[PDB]
């Protein structure tokens, strides 16, 4: 359904999408990693998803699985990132093992 949801979001109204003067598009989706609203970018159009996002101080990796397409309250999984920059990038590569580039 993801490509159907994507073509609805693309060709019709993505509420988060913002149109630049350049022509480029920008999701205001809070989980969107890049600012853009593209095929890979919309968290709504993709069920496997990830995002570095900060709650008040600590930075958390947010994981989204197709397994929890229903129950959006229990949707996002949270991982506390390390304060070591190297260790936290290693943690990213661990939790995104066998995951896309």
């Amino acid at each position: 359904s993801d490509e159907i949801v994507w073509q609805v979001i693309n060709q019709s109204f993505c509420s988060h999408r913002i149109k630049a003067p350049n022509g480029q598009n920008f999701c205001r989706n809070e989980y969107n990693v890049t600012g853009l609203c593209t095929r890979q970018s919309c968290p709504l159009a993709n069920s496997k998803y990830a995002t570095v996002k900060c709650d008040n101080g600590k930075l958390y990796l947010y994981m989204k699985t197709p397994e929890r397409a229903h129950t959006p309250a229990k949707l996002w999984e949270r991982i506390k990132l390390s304060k070591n920059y190297t260790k936290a990038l290693q943690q990213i590569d661990e939790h995104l093992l066998h995951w896309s580039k």
Binding site: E3, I4, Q7, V8
Partner: protein, 132 residues
């Protein structure tokens, strides 16, 4: 003429994306024919009666072929005996769909057709007889 469907059926554009991946990445002329047929208008997609399908299955060596209709498979009560065969198409009227199922056959969508014959192995394509 058309290099794109002038329709805005989303599922149709999905099949266009699938068959354009095929018609680029296959070497069989089949998927190119399917792509060119997907662009056709409603006038340029005349319906195909199931009577015409059975009369087509009366051809030699076609009984183990599968049939493909870019268009609509419509029913006709003027036939009684319809063979057990595999028909893939865009749309199925419920009468023709019950004719195919009731004859023990199979009503196939074109995505499943691409899965079964990516190179178009052992197929038939029928076009409705256009007059006007």
């Amino acid at each position: 003429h058309r290099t794109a469907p002038k329709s805005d059926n989303v599922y149709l554009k999905l099949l266009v994306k699938l068959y354009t991946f095929l018609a680029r990445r296959t070497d069989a002329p089949f998927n190119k024919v399917v792509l060119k047929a997907l662009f056709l208008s409603k006038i340029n997609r005349p319906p195909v009666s199931v009577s015409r399908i059975a009369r087509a299955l009366k051809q030699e060596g076609a009984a183990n072929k599968t049939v493909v209709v870019v268009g609509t498979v419509t029913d006709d009560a003027r036939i009684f005996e319809f063979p057990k065969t595999t028909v893939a198409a865009l749309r199925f009227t419920a009468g023709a769909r019950a004719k195919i199922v009731k004859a023990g056959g199979e009503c196939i969508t074109l995505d499943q057709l691409a899965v079964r014959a990516p190179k178009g192995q052992n197929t038939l394509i029928l076009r409705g007889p256009r007059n006007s």
